[model samples]
Target chain A: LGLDCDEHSSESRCCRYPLTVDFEAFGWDWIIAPKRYKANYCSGQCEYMFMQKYPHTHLVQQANPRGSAGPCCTPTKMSPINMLYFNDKQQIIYGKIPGMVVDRCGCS
Target chain B: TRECIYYNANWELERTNQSGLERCEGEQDKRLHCYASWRNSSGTIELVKKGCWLDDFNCYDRQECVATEENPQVYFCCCEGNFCNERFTHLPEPG
Candidate 1:
């Protein structure tokens, strides 16, 4: 709810917003370290105004407006956050989860 | 202008399996992409199929014919551009 730009005010462009995820709140104890970690998200608008750079999406929404949901502002690129957690065996593990961070966003 | 090359070597008649332009379905309000695949045969590759890739949320916004490393026998490439999938090439990496 708090991850988007104001429609008529702030410029809309797919961008990342800082998000703090608490593993304990999810009732999961397997995850360890960096709780409330920096888990960002992609949000905002793809409306022209240079908010996003997608000529294809622009062309698609040109006319004959009968298409469904068309293109939207979404994650076009992302990176995973390193994590230290426990596997099924209750063993501590450190690894990478792909696409955890939104490095870039674009209309798709 | 919202059209893509279509083909399916596995089905349809030979006359239709080659290459033909088909306008993308729906209201030209979506990114029109083309996808093509080639299956390996006796160390050589043969075009398996091609067509307009609609509603492929997984296709992303790639502008070129990019291949993944997941399948070795069959190389699949998805691209954006009018009539882009007219042809596809591969030699371990997408060409």
Candidate 2:
């Protein structure tokens, strides 16, 4: 069980919306935050599952306070949780339910 | 012990039965213990029977089914489509 929030910065031309994750096929559960998540830019960047014009696996530049050239870094991806369902025979079944867990404080 | 269960179209636990007798004299019942299997329906994954129809009680998931460590119950963890979930014949859940 783990949780992660997204973040990004702007004015230096940066965007980090979607994160990279590979946690399917294992029946593991995880929560992805969205409402209270952090972002770098509000103008050019729209936060969700992926970055602007790129897939969810794209790398974003890590900006520093000094405004030096930011380094290209990977984005954080949310992991999906597995749900268990029982059939008539009492056998156990697992499925992937894709949804982000939002907190009352709106923090991802 | 053994347990028997029947499910309806919705795949809910509708019926369950248990046989307290651990041994059946002069009777050969393959389903005398827990039996686990996977079932498919309209775009839904179902975990079939948690106990044997002949068992005295239905075994709950993540719980010990019997005193015989080797004779533990069986459960089929299945995924939707044609994927198979994990299987545990005789093991305890994590603490």
What Cα-based lDDT does every candidate model obtain? 0.57, 0.29
Let me know the DockQ for model 1: 0.01
Model 1 misplaced stretches (Cα beyond 4 Å) = A1-9, A49-59, A62-70, B1-95
Lowest lDDT 10-mer window, candidate 2 chain B?
A: B77-86
Please compute DockQ, using alpha carbons, for every candidate against the native two-chain complex. Answer: 0.01, 0.03
Query: What lDDT does model 2 reach?
Result: 0.29
Fraction of real interface contacts that model 1 preserves: 0.00
Give, for candidate 1 chain B, the lowest lDDT window spanning 10 residues: B51-60
Q: What is the interface RMSD of each candidate, in Å?
A: 14.8, 18.6
User: Could you give candidate 2's per-residue lDDT for residues A1-108 as a string of tens digits?
Assistant: 112224543322223333333233344223111102112211222233323333322333222232443223233332233333444565444334444311111112
Q: What digit string (tens of lDDT, one per residue) describes model 2 on residues B13-88?
A: 4333322212211123211333334344564555443322221112223232322222223223211111111233
User: By TM-score, how accurate is candidate 1?
Assistant: 0.41
